[PDB]
Each structure stands twice: as C-alpha cells, then as structure tokens.
Amino acid sequence: KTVLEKSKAGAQSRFDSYGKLYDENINAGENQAMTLRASAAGLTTAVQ
Amino acid sequence: YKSRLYLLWLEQKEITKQYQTETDYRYELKLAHIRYDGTWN
After folding, report:
1. Are B15 and B26 in contact (CB under 8 A)?
2. Does B39 touch chain A (CB under 8 A)?
3. Whose CA is closest to B27, among B41, B15, B36, B35?
4. Are the beta carbons of A42 and B35 separated by less than 8 Å?
5. Alpha-carbon distance A39 to A29, whole Å?
6. Residues on chain B touching A42 (C-beta within 8 angstroms)
7. Which DSSP string corresponds to B1-41?
C-alpha cells in the first residue's frame, strides 16, 4: 500500500509541475523576446 | 494642419557665383509631416 502511495505522490508531483508550467504559458522574458522581434520587424517605414 | 503635426524649416546651401569668383547663398524651404505609424514622412 505505501509503495502505491509513493508512486501516487510522484505522479502527482508531475501533474502539479506540468499544471504550473501550462498555466504560465509565456514567460515574461519570452514575451519580451517576441515583442523585440516585432519591433525589429516594423520600421520599414522610416528606412524607406 | 488639418489635425496632424507638420513642421517647416529652411536650409541654406553654399553656391559660388560665376569674371568674379564669389561665395553666395541659395535658400530652400522644406516640409514634413508625421505618418500614422509614428514615422516622419
């Protein structure tokens, strides 16, 4: 019984991890990298 | 002008005038306006 319980604990440590990860889909940093590329993509106007 | 920002400025270019060699100035007016995206025209 305790063997099953330890396996349950492990499996749930995982569900909790992938839960918390899925919940913050895009990290502050990651969104900043994306918006940087967005900024570089613009400004065709000015160089024209 | 018509609810958009425009600016005017005037630039002077050095031009020599023809038997006499003399430094003289020519003046031209220039206009610009700001596009929607934020880039100056």
Report:
1. yes
2. yes
3. B15
4. no
5. 15
6. 37
7. -TTS-EEEEEEEEEEEE----EEEEEEEEEEEEB-TTS-B-
